[PDB]
Amino acid sequence: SLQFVFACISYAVGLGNVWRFPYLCQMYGGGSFLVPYIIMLIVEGMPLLYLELAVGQRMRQGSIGAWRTISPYLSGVGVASVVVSFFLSMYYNVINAWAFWYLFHSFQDPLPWSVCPLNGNHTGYDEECEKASSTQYFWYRKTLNISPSLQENGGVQWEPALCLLLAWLVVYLCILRGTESTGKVVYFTASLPYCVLIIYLIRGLTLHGATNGLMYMFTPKIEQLANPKAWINAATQIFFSLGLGFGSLIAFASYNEPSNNCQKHAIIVSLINSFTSIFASIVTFSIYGFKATFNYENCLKKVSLLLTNTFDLEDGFLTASNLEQVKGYLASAYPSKYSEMFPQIKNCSLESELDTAVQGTGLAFIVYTEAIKNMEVSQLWSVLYFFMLLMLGIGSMLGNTAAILTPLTDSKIISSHLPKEAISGLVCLVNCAIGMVFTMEAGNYWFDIFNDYAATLSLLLIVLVETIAVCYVYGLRRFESDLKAMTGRAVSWYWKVMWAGVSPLLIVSLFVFYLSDYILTGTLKYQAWDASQGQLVTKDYPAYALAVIGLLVASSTMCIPLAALGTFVQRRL
Amino acid sequence: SLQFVFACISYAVGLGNVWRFPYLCQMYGGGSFLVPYIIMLIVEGMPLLYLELAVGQRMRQGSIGAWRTISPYLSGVGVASVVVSFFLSMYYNVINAWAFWYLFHSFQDPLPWSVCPLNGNHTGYDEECEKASSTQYFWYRKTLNISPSLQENGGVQWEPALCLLLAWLVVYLCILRGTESTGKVVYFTASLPYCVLIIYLIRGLTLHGATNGLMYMFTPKIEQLANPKAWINAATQIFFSLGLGFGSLIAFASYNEPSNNCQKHAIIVSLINSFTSIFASIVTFSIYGFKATFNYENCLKKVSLLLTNTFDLEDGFLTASNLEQVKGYLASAYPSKYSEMFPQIKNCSLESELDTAVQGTGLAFIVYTEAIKNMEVSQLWSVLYFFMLLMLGIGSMLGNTAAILTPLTDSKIISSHLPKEAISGLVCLVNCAIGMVFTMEAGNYWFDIFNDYAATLSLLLIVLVETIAVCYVYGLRRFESDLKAMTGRAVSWYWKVMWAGVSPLLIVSLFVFYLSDYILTGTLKYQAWDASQGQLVTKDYPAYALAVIGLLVASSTMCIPLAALGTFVQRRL
Amino acid sequence: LKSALGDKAYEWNDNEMYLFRSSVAYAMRQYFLKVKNQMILFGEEDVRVANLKPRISFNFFVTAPKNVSDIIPRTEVEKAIRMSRSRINDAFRLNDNSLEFLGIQPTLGPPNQPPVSIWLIVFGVVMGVIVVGIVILIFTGIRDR
Amino acid sequence: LKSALGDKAYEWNDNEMYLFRSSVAYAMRQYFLKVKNQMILFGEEDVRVANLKPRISFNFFVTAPKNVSDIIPRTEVEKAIRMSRSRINDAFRLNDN
Ligand SMILES: CCCCCCCCCCCCCCCCCC(=O)OC[C@H](COP(=O)(O)O)OC(=O)CCCCCCCCCCCCCCCCC
Ligand SMILES: CCCCCCCCCCCCCCCCCC(=O)OC[C@H](COP(=O)(O)O)OC(=O)CCCCCCCCCCCCCCCCC
Ligand SMILES: CCCCCCCCCCCCCCCCCC(=O)OC[C@H](COP(=O)(O)O)OC(=O)CCCCCCCCCCCCCCCCC
Ligand SMILES: CCCCCCCCCCCCCCCCCC(=O)OC[C@H](COP(=O)(O)O)OC(=O)CCCCCCCCCCCCCCCCC
Ligand SMILES: CCCCCCCCCCCCCCCCCC(=O)OC[C@H](COP(=O)(O)O)OC(=O)CCCCCCCCCCCCCCCCC
Ligand SMILES: CCCCCCCCCCCCCCCCCC(=O)OC[C@H](COP(=O)(O)O)OC(=O)CCCCCCCCCCCCCCCCC
Ligand SMILES: *[C@@H]1O[C@H](CO)[C@@H](O[C@@H]2O[C@H](CO)[C@@H](O)[C@H](O)[C@H]2NC(C)=O)[C@H](O)[C@H]1NC(C)=O
Ligand SMILES: *[C@@H]1O[C@H](CO)[C@@H](O[C@@H]2O[C@H](CO)[C@@H](O)[C@H](O)[C@H]2NC(C)=O)[C@H](O)[C@H]1NC(C)=O
Ligand SMILES: *[C@@H]1O[C@H](CO)[C@@H](O[C@@H]2O[C@H](CO)[C@@H](O)[C@H](O)[C@H]2NC(C)=O)[C@H](O)[C@H]1NC(C)=O
Ligand SMILES: *[C@@H]1O[C@H](CO)[C@@H](O[C@@H]2O[C@H](CO)[C@@H](O)[C@H](O)[C@H]2NC(C)=O)[C@H](O)[C@H]1NC(C)=O
Ligand SMILES: *[C@@H]1O[C@H](CO)[C@@H](O)[C@H](O)[C@H]1NC(C)=O
Ligand SMILES: *[C@@H]1O[C@H](CO)[C@@H](O)[C@H](O)[C@H]1NC(C)=O
Ligand SMILES: *[C@@H]1O[C@H](CO)[C@@H](O)[C@H](O)[C@H]1NC(C)=O
Ligand SMILES: *[C@@H]1O[C@H](CO)[C@@H](O)[C@H](O)[C@H]1NC(C)=O
């Protein structure tokens, strides 16, 4: 029945699709991102997903017990996979905090991101609110109050702290009402995001200069397709969207799906996930192209007005087409007045503005809140879109917390003096308390640091070790015979070669390329805000900052060789 | 369960409640109408309704067969009761035609009843559209094109003819889909009118000068409470709203309700009917008072402006409170200029405008279409309200056609060569063809003539003869013993005296009072439009017009003494 | 002109300059009547115009009615134009960005309508409902377990 | 004034009459330039005003610039005012009623 398809849709659609994918796509060329995305999708989203579902269905055990039985060497992979989800949850909830804040600021008139404040002498608008737009300022200053560097930390604020607290409380309340939320309700929840995206696509396709965004998103230019930092971040974005490495899919199809097909399931999941991502990365980029072309026309109009007011020209003469003709003409009439005015003529082009308009980790927010002020009734659509994002957030949040609660409420050592609600609240409280780093003044930098490495590299390595283990330690022929005898169908040599050969070579090649291009350039530069100019400068990471960058991937991936040693000291006696 | 209550609500709410009741209430003093309405309600809406339901449940036969068995004298009461409904259906469908037309004219901008046309010299608006308002003109001229008298008939128009044809076709289609329309659908149909009335009450209570309409509607003045033409038309309005006389309620609770209570049923029906009538006669009168106070303020402003422009006065000096002071002051300054200007000073008062603002049989239309132009988005509410009125129309129409179809699809003489659909369509076509009198230029006058007498007097007499028969020809004691043995409950002496004594005396007294006040004044005057002045003048009925006035009640009530004679010639042999 | 009115703009002949000089004379009359309590009959010939350019641009100064050597100071003319700017704008269909008196800046438009943290109210109501559901759930799961 | 602007109306002193006479002079200049192809320097002293009443009311006629005996006909003044009425309205914030 259609219930299976709708449950699958609910499974797939998350936050890596409507929030993370556009931020990654804009950052790495746009056109030069889908090609690597589709490549990594077909080569590592079909085979490893199906392999993981198949193992979870075959062993019918938890995330840790399965790899415990496959070999005594490989027990710690479950511990690492659980630590990964633990790292995920904390910074993950901040995205729900932000949507909470934006939602609370939607019951006003006018909306605070639609106008700029006034200066002290009440003549014009604020100086910072003019360099940036009305929305970039509201994001970087009103809801974040970012510092111009990483060393100027400051102190914990009180508004984002409260929003994050409320987010943790509401996820607590949703988890206390049983570890189930669907049933006769999937038809509404799984459908609301697509309906709101259709609405916003209708709105954003009727904006002047929209085709520029789609052109920038689809058409690839072969100069950053040779960037290794694009391939790896495209593959691990897939790894992050499907849920690999988190040990959730293994434990899901373990006490479920007795003899149903795993191939059809994995294929539908991967297809709907990728489709959702590509369709959501278009409604954003139409509005992005609109913003870029608007800023470009503004550059042009400002320069034209300066030239008109300076010498003297009939208003409306120098518009946008004779600009170069008149620029040249004002070199044989009176260059004495022109030369000393040259350092003020702004040189603006559309490409340089499509490249850097709203780039950053708040792209979804700034862009979506930018297409609300240009709407008929703004508060309604703002409330609707932000409630949609909150639903997606609570969904992905409960789905991620399942992978950390269940491998804890089953061990018969810790479940003695602590009941279910108590330990759930304890984990929630520790997470809420550790997530207070991201409510400081330089908190967005720490959020960005915690996002990429901790969410990507560990899981990329763990799925690799999982595949190596299932292929060359348990026996490929043994497993295919087992699955034939269990399900009654033989897997094609297509998947048989994808499991063994292509993925475990591609992942290692992608890792060594990125590690080499890290070793041949040196230290890496992240970003900044530069409130005094209104653009993202690229300041360097401090030395103490690289410490946490190392420690994250270490403490989330070095749990394998310590399990392989604890299982070696116990095998001595 | 609540299904019974909602089915009862669907039973009660019709068109005599939202269309006919306000038109009658405004016409007869307003305040001096509810008092007679409630009196006649308590004295003739409880007892006769319960008696009719009880007889229909006791005999378990049709409308004609029951009175056939009660006595051979009384067979023709069913024929008369059927002829009444036949007379009803034809002019009844015109009300659905009009709502159809108004609905079709709701997909425009601006709506045609919201502005006036221009004159020939394009300087100002039309002359007729200014005397009347923008809505009275659109009703009397655009959708009706009424003639200034009854003798100027003219020829059948083609727009209202088409609307009436479409109405008959759609009622045909609704009747062809089985003689049942409810079931798991009552919760929506019975509720929509109530919801739309709440909406319009919310809108109409926030209009300047609304309390005047409610004051005029509720507060009675004892000078027209002595008008006999108010009591009779208030009692027979009840008779028309509950469905007495039409023989539909007898045939309804005949093959149904085995041993359930009839008292509770009749009480709920009467209460919800009267409650809906009184609640709907308030949303209209709030807007009516608004219209009246607006027209009064307009009179005052026009006179003030004339006085200002005439002599000379600072604009804004003579507003509405010093009007009498200044009127008197301009008699000791220069009466030489004042006297020759006196026949132009309009004398306007609020009472004389509340008495005659929108009076007529299109009151519901003109008033409701007047509170749409004063709304935020007009087309939406217009479409909603007119679709509501169309639902009510089709409902009452099918309910009235049931009483004419079923006593025809059962007689085993005519059902031989004509199947169900064929005879249904034949009656529908004959009705559509006879209802073409009401699409002429003087068609509204014929509609008004056919409405009152044919819908009221026959049924008022037929329920009287029904009660006399059931009380003094079948035996009161026999019937109460039968009902006690059948249902297991004794009726109180309350209803026992209401059946025998109070109603058969009150109806005859009310009839002789009205017939005397007809004989002591002479001929009666109906109304006219007087397009050249913009108010309803009261021209006389022509002599040939009284012919149909007589023939209607004759051919719909004189079927009793011919049955009493046909049953006398057969009892000779 | 083209910036303000689009393809609906009139052309600027010397009758428009006549009307501008009359508007400035009216503004001076009003300022000297309502502030200095004097009645001075400025005319259109007391507004001296110079440097007329085709991008619509000029300088002007004002002289006492019949004493050509008496120049009203620039500060009093600035005050007189501030007092009547919204009327000179209307006479030409310009909107304070299309009619610039260089050196005189408009300083209005303060926003005011919030009585507090309108967002704090919804935050508080949601937090109340959430904590209430929380205690209900803890009580249920405790006494039933 | 009170009908159009409400409790926001200015008061009508003689500077307002000066501005009205200048507006009428401008309208006459424009009509004689754009229709008759002549350039005539009408001034505010060529618009003669009479019968000033407190309900705002007067009569006016127009005279050639320096020939006091030369009265422009009523028809040409009506045309000149039709041509520029939407501008005289704007100068005073009035709306043709
Ligand atoms: C946020 C971080 C998340 C942390 C979540 C991790 C939770 C599990 C951590 C441990 C997983 C690593 C496996 C290491 C092997 C255990 C060591 C050992 O057996 O001691 C040898 C131990 C002897 O070691 P010795 O100290 O060297 O002599 O053998 C024993 O005699 C211990 C007696 C066993 C008592 C039974 C207790 C039953 C609970 C066990 C279940 C816990 C595993 C959870 C797996 C769920 C699948 C069903
Ligand atoms: C947004 C983030 C925050 C969200 C909210 C988080 C807040 C939730 C945190 C809740 C923490 C408390 C949970 C309450 C659970 C129910 C309370 C209850 O039923 O109490 C009954 C009751 C409470 O006291 P009462 O007032 O007398 O009812 O406690 C008892 O009377 C039972 C007797 C307790 C015996 C103590 C001995 C236990 C240990 C034995 C020796 C070993 C020591 C090791 C201890 C283990 C600790 C790790
Ligand atoms: C555009 C959105 C997606 C479009 C696709 C719509 C949905 C497709 C449904 C999938 C069809 C499968 C139905 C069930 C049958 C299972 C398939 C099966 O048996 O596989 C084993 C099948 C068995 O073959 P054997 O080697 O003979 O055993 O393996 C194959 O040989 C098929 C190989 C096809 C490779 C995938 C298709 C594309 C590869 C070529 C390069 C693609 C360029 C990427 C650019 C895309 C741009 C958008
Ligand atoms: C829009 C107008 C609506 C019109 C709807 C009215 C439909 C019914 C009209 C007749 C009602 C008046 C009753 C008059 C008594 C009938 C005359 C008579 O019996 O002839 C004597 C007749 C002798 O009369 P003679 O001509 O004087 O000798 O007796 C017979 O021998 C006739 C043989 C009877 C044949 C059986 C036919 C079965 C159909 C009868 C059913 C019709 C009544 C419908 C009632 C429904 C309740 C179940
Ligand atoms: C909006 C207002 C208008 C709404 C729409 C109203 C229009 C509906 C009116 C419909 C009128 C016709 C209904 C059609 C019914 C089905 C047609 C059909 O099945 O025909 C098969 C068929 C039609 O011809 P076909 O083309 O050969 O199929 O007719 C036959 O072949 C059957 C043979 C008929 C025998 C004739 C003898 C019957 C009478 C015997 C002597 C007595 C004479 C008295 C006649 C009684 C008349 C009162
Ligand atoms: C405001 C909207 C309506 C308000 C009423 C709300 C609903 C009322 C539910 C009806 C109560 C009956 C429940 C079931 C019992 C059946 C009654 C029963 O047994 O009757 C036989 C009952 C048996 O009595 P017996 O004579 O001892 O056998 O008859 C009576 O004695 C009751 C007589 C009461 C008359 C009706 C009430 C009003 C009469 C006084 C004048 C009214 C002024 C009208 C102005 C109204 C202004 C709005
Ligand atoms: C806009 O473009 C012009 C020309 O492409 C730039 O002017 C050039 O500046 C370089 C130095 O940076 C000179 O060597 C060239 O001779 C200049 N060109 C000309 C034609 O004079 C200009 O710098 C650009 N705008 C900005 C803001 O840099
Ligand atoms: C308005 O009211 C006035 C006074 O109430 C009416 O004038 C009276 O007219 C009658 C004749 O119809 C005279 O006999 C009275 O002397 C008049 N009264 C005064 C005070 O002069 C006037 O007719 C009313 N308006 C209209 C239109 O009839
Ligand atoms: C014209 O205006 C000038 C000022 O601009 C007047 O000049 C003043 O004249 C008095 C004596 O007449 C001197 O004491 C002042 O010092 C003069 N002022 C300046 C600034 O020079 C002049 O009087 C005015 N003439 C008329 C006829 O009013
Ligand atoms: C002033 O205008 C009048 C017209 O209003 C002129 O009068 C005309 O004068 C010529 C000869 O000078 C006569 O032939 C015409 O018959 C006169 N017209 C009228 C209507 O009387 C007068 O010439 C003008 N004066 C100046 C100095 O221009
Ligand atoms: C604008 O404000 C600054 C201080 O914020 C002040 O120094 C300056 O004088 C103001 N501008 C004017 C024209 O007064
Ligand atoms: C641009 O300037 C040229 C003169 O160099 C002129 O001929 C042309 O009409 C101008 N274009 C527009 C659109 O005004
Ligand atoms: C108004 O129209 C009528 C004819 O409808 C015409 O006789 C009259 O002259 C017009 N008014 C004017 C001022 O021309
Ligand atoms: C009405 O006129 C009187 C003079 O008779 C005046 O005193 C009063 O202020 C006027 N009322 C209003 C509201 O203007």
Author numbering:
A (entry chain B), B (entry chain D): 11 to 583
C (entry chain A): 624 to 768
D (entry chain C): 624 to 720
Question: How do the authors describe this structure?
Answer:
Angiotensin-converting enzyme 2 (ACE2) is the critical cellular receptor for SARS-CoV-2, directly binding with the receptor binding domain (RBD) of spike glycoprotein (S protein). The CLD of ACE2 is reported as the chaperone for membrane trafficking of amino acid transporter B0AT1 (SLC6A19) and SIT1 (SLC6A20). Here, we report the cryo-EM structures of the full-length human ACE2 bound to the RBD of the SARS-CoV-2 Omicron subvariants BA.2 and BA.4/BA.5 (hereafter referred to as BA.5) at an overall resolution of 3.1 Å and 3.2 Å in the presence of SIT1, respectively. From an overall view, the RBD binds to the ACE2–SIT1 complex with a ratio of 2:2:2.
To reveal the interaction details between ACE2–SIT1 and the SARS-CoV-2 Omicron variants, the RBD from SARS-CoV-2 BA.2 and BA.5 subvariants, respectively, was mixed with ACE2–SIT1 complex at a stoichiometric ratio of ~2.4:1 for 30 min and applied to SEC to remove excess RBD. The cryo-EM structures of Omicron BA.2/5 bound with ACE2–SIT1 complex were determined at an overall resolution of 3.1 Å and 3.2 Å, respectively. The interfaces between RBD and ACE2 were further improved to 3.0 Å and 3.1 Å, respectively, with the focused refinement, supporting reliable modelling and interface analysis. Each PD binds to one RBD. The interface between RBD and ACE2-PD for BA.2 and BA.5 is almost consistent except that Arg493 of BA.2 forms a new salt bridge with Glu35 of ACE2, whereas Wildtype (WT) and BA.5 retain Gln493. Taken together, these mutations of Omicron subvariants remodeled the interaction net between RBD and ACE2. ACE2 interacts with SIT1 extensively via the extracellular region and the membrane region. When compared to dDAT and other LeuT-fold transporters, TM7 of SIT1 or B0AT1 is particularly long with its C-terminus extruding out of the membrane and connected with ACE2.
